[PDB]
Amino acid sequence: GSSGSSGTQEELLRWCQEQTAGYPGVHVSDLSSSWADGLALCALVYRLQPGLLEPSELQGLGALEATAWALKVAENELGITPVVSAQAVVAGSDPLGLIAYLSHFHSAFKSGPSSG
Numbered sequence: 001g002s003s004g005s006s007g008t009q010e011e012l013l014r015w016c017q018e019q020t021a022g023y024p025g026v027h028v029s030d031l032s033s034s035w036a037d038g039l040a041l042c043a044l045v046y047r048l049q050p051g052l053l054e055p056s057e058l059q060g061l062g063a064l065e066a067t068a069w070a071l072k073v074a075e076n077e078l079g080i081t082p083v084v085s086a087q088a089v090v091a092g093s094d095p096l097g098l099i100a101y102l103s104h105f106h107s108a109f110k111s112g113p114s115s116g
Contacts, residue, residue, distance in 0.1 A: 006116045009099065012106045016040075019047045031099055036092045038066030044102075045070045045078065048109055052077055064090050080104045 002018075004010065013031060020026040023043030028034045035041060042058050052073055058066045067086040074080045083104070084097035 003112050004116065006113055011110075012099075012102055015106055015110070016044055016102065019044050022047050031102065032095060033092060035098055035102075036063070036090050038063045038068075038070070038090055041070035041074070041089070042066045044105060045074050048105065049077060074105070078105065078108070080108070 002015070004014075009031060013028065017028050020028045020040055020043040023039065023046065026037075026039045026043040028040055038061075039058070042055055046052060046055055055066075055069070058069055064086060067090050071082040071086050075082050080101070081104075083101040084094060088094040089098050089101070
């Protein structure tokens with residue numbers, strides 16, 4: 001039951017919500033600061049692929065320490081080149097880059113109606 005306008009960020013956000021949801025503590029409510037923490041990206045990645053290692057350290061790592069991994073396992077496994085600097089994401093300087101960065105994840109791990 002996942003379908004709507006498949007056009008606005010809503011399609012991505014919601015999609016990411018269901019993913020991160022699983023991860024305890026990670027609650028994506030807005031693509032502004034909800035992803036700044038760092039775990040967010042970590043959850044989205046770890047979840048997307050339950051086969052990849054688990055966050056044994058990320059559990060108690062620094063807001064940045066986390067994002068670091070995500071961008072890694074994402075650029076290695078997922079292959080989603082890091083369009084934004086782990087710092088920019090967490091620091092919260094380039095809110096645009098992040099959006100584009102995530103867009104890649106979905107664009108690859110998306111499904112449903114193309115033109116609503």
